[PDB]
Structure formats: C-alpha cells, structure tokens
C-alpha cells in the first residue's frame, strides 16, 4: 500500500515537540497525512476522502498573518507529538478526533477576538454568544465533512460517528483561552486531592482541552527563534484589531495598541507567567511525557527575561 515518507531531517525531527512544520506550504498536507498513518494507522481514512477533505480545509482558512493554515498544521503537530509520547492513554476514535479537531480548529478564522466581534455587532456574536469564533469553527468542520466525497468518518456507526463529532466539538471549543483558566484550575484541583479519574469521561474531557491549549500555544515551546518570528505573526493580527477598536472609537487593552509595541518583551513575560507555564506545568503533572513542552517554554521565558536585561 501507499505509505508517505518524509525526508531524513523530518523522519527524525517530526517526532520531537519543537519541530517546525517550515516554509514549504506544499508539503503541509504530506507532513499531516504522514501523522495521522502513524498515530491513527493507514486504515483510519480512505486516502482520496482524507486528501479531498485537507484541501478543502486548506482553503477554508483565510490569508490572516497568524490564525492561516500553517497555525492549523502547527496545531495538529503537537497534538501528534502528545499523542505519540501517551501511546496506550487514547480510544481509537480520540486518536482520530484529535489530529482532525487541531486541522480544523480555527476554520475561517478573520484575525479578530470574539470581543471584537462582540463590539463590531458582527452577525456570528448573535448565532454564538460565547464561544463566538469557536462555535463558528466547528460549524465549518461540520460543512466541509458534509460536502460529496468529504466523509471520512463513513466507515464508523452512527453512534461512533456522533462520538467522534462531540470529541471535536468539546475540543475546538476548548481553544476559546477564556475558558481554559477555570478548566486549568479545576484539573489542578482533581490532580492534588487525587480524585482525577481518566475513566471518567468528563475528566478525559477537561484533560483533552488542556492538551487543545498546550498544542493551539505551542509557538511558545519552539527553538528560540521560531518563537520570537511567530510572535511578530501574532501581534500583526493584535495590532490591527487595536486599529479597528480605534475605528469603533474604543481604547484598545495593550497586547492589542501598536503605540505599546516597545513594551512588547514584558507583555510575552506575562503570558509565560500567566497562561503558557501553569499551561505546561499542569499537562506535565498529568501527562508526565509532555515535559519536554515545558522545559521549552521555560528556555523561551529565560529568552524574554534576556531581551529586558538588554543581553538580547
Ligand atoms: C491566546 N493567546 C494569546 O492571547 C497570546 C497573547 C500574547 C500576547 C501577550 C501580551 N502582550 C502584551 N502586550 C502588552 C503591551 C505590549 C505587549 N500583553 N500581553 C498579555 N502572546 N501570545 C503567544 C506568544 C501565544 C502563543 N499566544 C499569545
Ligand atoms: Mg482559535
Ligand atoms: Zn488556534
């Protein structure tokens, strides 16, 4: 049969969690498809149907500096790496699910926060109240699996078919940040009085959208200068959301005001501090082989405190 294979250098380096996916867009579909055979098997999905169904998916995220296709497949990518390294934690359907929940997450995505949406009236904040650009999200998902020869899913039964559906539901909607903080802090919880219980769904729940966190942030567990690139990515898109605030005649809070651009290296200080470490530290505490994500947001947090003190 049709096995893809990579060259050496991706072979090798497509398994550690700090690989870049690189510049070549055209070999994106290849690296993911490469993925799913190795995490899922070759007979999770029919080729054409798979191929069909990337490319559609590809064409559904938009020309954005930072929330594009490259963000999807990144995304995917570490969602491999956590999978690879937990071999015997996931059902067969979460396997499949997740890789598929990564590509997909951000379908569509404009550059804006659901709060811009919310303050531009945009017609998706009265579909989708909370959750805007997410709910939106697996609204596309679902879409493009209902175009002719899109199915991928059509060996399954109708019920292992609305399973794997809700495993990509509750994941995609687990990438809206506002809710990770009190999921984050609920798992912190059940992990130190030990009632957390990987039998329960509602627990594999809350720990599979911490892993959808872990991989829709881990810009921040990259070789140094993957990091600092992807964050002028992102802060282009911040940047010109503070720009269409200004237009609404609202202040824009700082991450998102280019006036704010020199305060840039204490901003990322407080993400790693707020959000990306208790992020990785809770995922390592439950999932002990995604270290590695850690220690490399902790060498990227050292990297930040380098360019206050001015050594960089
Ligand atoms: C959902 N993700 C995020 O919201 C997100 C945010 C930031 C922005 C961090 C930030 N900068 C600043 N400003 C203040 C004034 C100058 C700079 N304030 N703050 C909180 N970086 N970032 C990364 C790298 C990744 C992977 N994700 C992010
Ligand atoms: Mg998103
Ligand atoms: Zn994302």
Redesign the pocket.
């Known amino acids: 049969l049709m096995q893809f294979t990579l060259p050496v250098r991706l072979c090798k380096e497509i398994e550690l969690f700090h690989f870049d996916i690189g510049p070549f867009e055209n070999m994106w579909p290849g690296i993911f498809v490469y993925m799913v055979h190795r995490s899922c098997g070759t007979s999770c999905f029919e080729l054409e149907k798979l191929c069909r169904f990337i490319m559609s998916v590809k064409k559904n995220y938009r020309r954005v500096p930072y929330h594009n296709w490259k963000h999807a497949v990144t995304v995917a990518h570490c969602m491999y790496a956590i999978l690879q390294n937990n071999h015997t934690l996931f059902t067969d359907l979460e396997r499949k699910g997740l890789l598929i929940a990564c590509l997909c997450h951000d379908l569509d995505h404009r550059g804006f926060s659901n709060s811009y949406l919310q303050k531009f009236d945009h017609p998706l904040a009265a579909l989708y109240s909370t959750s805007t650009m997410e709910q939106h999200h697996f609204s596309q998902t679902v879409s493009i699996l209902q175009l002719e020869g899109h199915n991928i899913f059509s060996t399954l039964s109708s019920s292992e078919y609305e399973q794997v559906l809700e495993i990509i539901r509750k994941a995609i909607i687990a990438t809206d940040?506002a809710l990770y903080f009190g999921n984050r802090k609920q798992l912190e919880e059940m992990y130190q009085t030990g009632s957390l219980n990987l039998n329960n769904q509602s627990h594999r729940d809350r720990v599979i959208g911490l892993m959808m966190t872990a991989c829709?942030?881990?810009?921040?567990t990259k070789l140094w200068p993957v990091?600092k690139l992807?964050?002028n990515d992102?802060?282009a898109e911040?940047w010109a959301e503070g720009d269409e605030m200004k237009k609404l005649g609202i202040q824009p809070?700082?991450?998102m005001?280019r006036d704010?651009?020199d305060?840039?290296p204490?901003?990322?200080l407080?993400?790693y501090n707020?959000?990306?470490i208790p992020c990785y530290t809770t995922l390592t505490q439950i999932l002990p082989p995604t270290e590695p994500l850690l220690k490399a947001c902790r060498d990227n947090l050292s990297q930040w405190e380098k360019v206050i003190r001015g050594e960089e």
């Open positions: 940040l829709d942030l881990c810009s921040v990091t992807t964050a992102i802060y911040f809070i700082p991450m005001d704010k651009k305060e840039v204490q901003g990322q407080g993400f707020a959000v990306a």
